[PDB]
């Protein structure tokens, strides 16, 4: 099988920035190689077939280079409907094999999270389960460190999170972490708090609150 | 203009089997090769099959040989996709794709894929999984007594334990949508899904604004309304 490896995985730019992606084939390809666009929730779209010819109807910013086992894309002049995911694909012998593809997201300034933390509601309570939620609120860049320690105690492996695509008004993310215990659990200690390391903190925030 | 339609996707059982349709307008399918790919959630573009014109020639990708068969109708400008031994991993929505053609000269069945899939359907979507359909239960994100006075409050809801995707969540029946986040769901070890979707307000609405969150389940003909108040 043909691996094919995309470099970056993900991309910051801005409106009217030239991008460039690459793509490596692990064996020779020729010029067989095509460039996809896809967005959240929709099908791709093709934009380059055979290494460099358009496809009809995609603008002309877009364009291909390469051929054996080098390739690029580069759009010129970004625009608002440029930020998507890209992918290469190899069709030169089956299986047909993608890169992993890479994120073109939008360049904004860096802009630290609002931390909030949610004790567990006393109606869930009443079926042995406890969630407690922080939420990262509309900070950017994406990268985040969520920590929960309940009565000082580091937790590890009963959590889980889950971020939002970019922002269109604002290119802010935000993120969800979910401490899951027993109700027997939860209810043995006092102090929960969630601690978050950001880019745009100067120090790690934490939120808590006393159980009661 | 041309159009391609994908359909039959739905929810399975582990072991069961399940069959894909792709139906086209605007032009003669037979015309073209065709291919299946599949996107499991948050993941790659994964390549699964390929089926010439003709339907002479077929490919398999390695994860879906022996389990999948690719075939087409031309007489019913169709393309199908046979699944036996349906697995969890194989959750994905479900592509099918036309073949490009070349500009001058043709590429043969054998390498008919040479030249990318240029019309794409909008997918189906398979779900493999043991769990059974299940409403979710909505429990209260509070907004903390903690909230600044005369600043911003964050609340929200808390949505678990439903299976299977999606569900719709709206705030105030839809007056309410600025500085709302519906985070994607995440699979729990349970197999049943959960999310949350929050929103911040001025903290000086909390004591005269009522907020609530609208939860719609359509798998189980689930709607749910949660009031999100001040803990007493």
């Known amino acids: 099988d043909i691996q094919m490896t995309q470099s970056p995985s993900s991309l910051s730019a801005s409106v009217g920035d030239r991008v460039t992606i690459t793509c490596r084939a692990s064996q020779r390809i020729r010029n067989y190689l095509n460039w996809y666009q896809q967005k959240p929730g929709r099908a791709p779209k093709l934009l380059i077939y055979?290494?460099?010819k358009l496809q009809g109807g995609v603008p002309s910013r877009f364009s291909g280079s390469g051929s054996g086992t080098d390739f690029t894309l580069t759009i010129n002049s970004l625009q608002p409907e440029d930020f998507a995911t890209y992918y290469c694909?190899?069709?030169?012998?089956?299986?047909?094999?993608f890169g992993q593809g890479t994120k073109i997201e939008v360049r904004r300034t860096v802009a630290a999270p609002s931390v909030f933390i949610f004790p567990p509601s006393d109606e869930q309570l009443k079926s042995g389960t406890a969630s407690v939620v922080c939420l990262l609120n509309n900070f950017y860049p994406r990268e985040a460190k969520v920590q929960w320690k309940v009565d000082n105690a580091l937790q590890s492996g009963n959590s889980q999170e889950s971020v939002t695509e970019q922002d269109s008004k604002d290119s802010t993310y935000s993120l969800s972490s979910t401490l899951t215990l027993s109700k027997a659990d939860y209810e043995k200690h006092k102090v929960y708090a969630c601690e978050v390391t950001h880019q745009g903190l100067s120090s790690p925030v934490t939120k808590s609150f006393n159980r009661g | 203009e041309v159009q391609l339609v994908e359909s039959g996707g739905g929810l399975v059982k582990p072991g069961g089997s399940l069959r894909l349709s792709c139906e086209v307008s605007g032009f003669t399918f037979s015309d073209y090769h065709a291919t299946w790919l599949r996107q499991a959630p948050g993941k790659g573009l994964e390549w699964i099959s390929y089926?010439?014109?003709?339907?002479?020639?077929?490919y398999y990708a390695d994860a879906v040989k022996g389990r999948f068969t690719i075939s087409r109708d031309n007489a019913k400008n169709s393309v199908y996709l046979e699944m036996s031994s349906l697995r969890d991993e194989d959750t994905a929505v479900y592509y099918c794709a036309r073949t490009r053609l070349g500009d001058i000269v043709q590429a043969p069945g054998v390498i008919g894929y040479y030249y990318g899939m240029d019309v794409w359907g909008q997918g189906t979507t398979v779900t493999v999984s043991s769990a059974s359909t299940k409403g979710p239960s909505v429990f209260p994100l509070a907004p903390s007594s903690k909230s600044t006075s005369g600043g911003t409050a964050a609340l929200g809801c808390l949505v678990k334990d439903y299976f299977p995707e999606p569900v719709t969540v709206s705030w105030n029946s839809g007056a309410l949508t600025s500085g709302v986040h519906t985070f994607p769901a995440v699979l729990q070890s349970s197999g049943l899904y959960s999310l949350s979707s929050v929103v911040t307000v001025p903290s000086s609405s909390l004591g005269t604004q009522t907020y609530i969150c609208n939860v719609n389940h359509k798998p189980s003909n689930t709607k749910v309304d949660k009031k999100v108040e001040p803990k007493s």
């Open positions: 694909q190899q069709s030169h012998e089956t299986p047909l094999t």
């Open positions: 089926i010439s014109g003709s339907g002479s020639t077929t």
């Open positions: 055979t290494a460099s």
